[PDB]
From Swiss-Prot:
This is Protease 2A. Homodimer. It comes from the Viruses. Zn(2+) 1 binds at residues 50, 52, 110, 112. The chain holds residues 869 to 1007 of 2193 of the full protein. It catalyses: Selective cleavage of Tyr-|-Gly bond in the picornavirus polyprotein. The lineage of its organism: Viruses, Riboviria, Orthornavirae, Pisuviricota, Pisoniviricetes. The active site is at 15 (for protease 2a activity), 33 (for protease 2a activity), 104 (for protease 2a activity). Cysteine protease that cleaves viral polyprotein and specific host proteins. It is responsible for the autocatalytic cleavage between the P1 and P2 regions, which is the first cleavage occurring in the polyprotein. Also cleaves the host translation initiation factor EIF4G1, in order to shut down the capped cellular mRNA translation. Inhibits the host nucleus-cytoplasm protein and RNA trafficking by cleaving host members of the nuclear pores. Counteracts stress granule formation probably by antagonizing its assembly or promoting its dissassembly.
Length: 139
């Protein structure tokens, strides 16, 4: 659970996208686990345009927001799931922090805005799919 609503766009983990996200598809990328679908209402989330490596993310499995240091967007091996075969996911940032599979979609934020959303995790780590490079979300 969890999405980013900026202007006329809904941003979700592609593996959790609904039929409505696919029937109103703008852009999707399985290598990033992202899908952006069109919306009728005007979303008000601000996207960060920055190179921050510290922030706060929401963890639904603990009902808690946690401060985290995270890595720079990169290609990281992600083990095979029911949604994807074993592959490298690009634009992924790791942090030391608790996460569980239902945590996908939890927003990562810094002082500048929305950085990305929980997409992977395990073993005391949490991986976030970055969205700061997607400049078309604001235009
Ligand atoms: N991006 C992917 O390919 C995902 C697809 C769903 C499964 N993936 C996970 O990482 C499961 C998982 C385990 C343990 C903690 C967490 C936190 C978020 O997912 C967690 C990989
Ligand atoms: Zn920032």
């Amino acid at each position: 659970s969890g999405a980013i609503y900026v202007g006329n766009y809904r941003v979700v983990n592609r593996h959790l996208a609904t039929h409505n996200d696919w029937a109103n598809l703008v852009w999707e990328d399985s290598s990033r686990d992202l899908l952006v679908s069109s919306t009728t209402a005007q979303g008000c989330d601000t996207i960060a345009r920055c190179d921050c490596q510290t922030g706060v993310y929401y963890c639904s499995s603990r009902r808690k927001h946690y401060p985290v240091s995270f890595s720079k967007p990169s290609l990281i091996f992600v083990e095979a799931s029911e949604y994807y075969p074993a592959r490298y996911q690009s634009h992924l940032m790791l942090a030391v922090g608790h996460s569980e599979p239902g945590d996908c979609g939890g927003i990562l934020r810094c002082q500048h805005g929305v950085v990305g959303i929980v997409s992977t995790g395990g073993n005391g780590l949490v991986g976030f799919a970055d969205v700061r490079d997607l400049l078309w979300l604001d235009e």
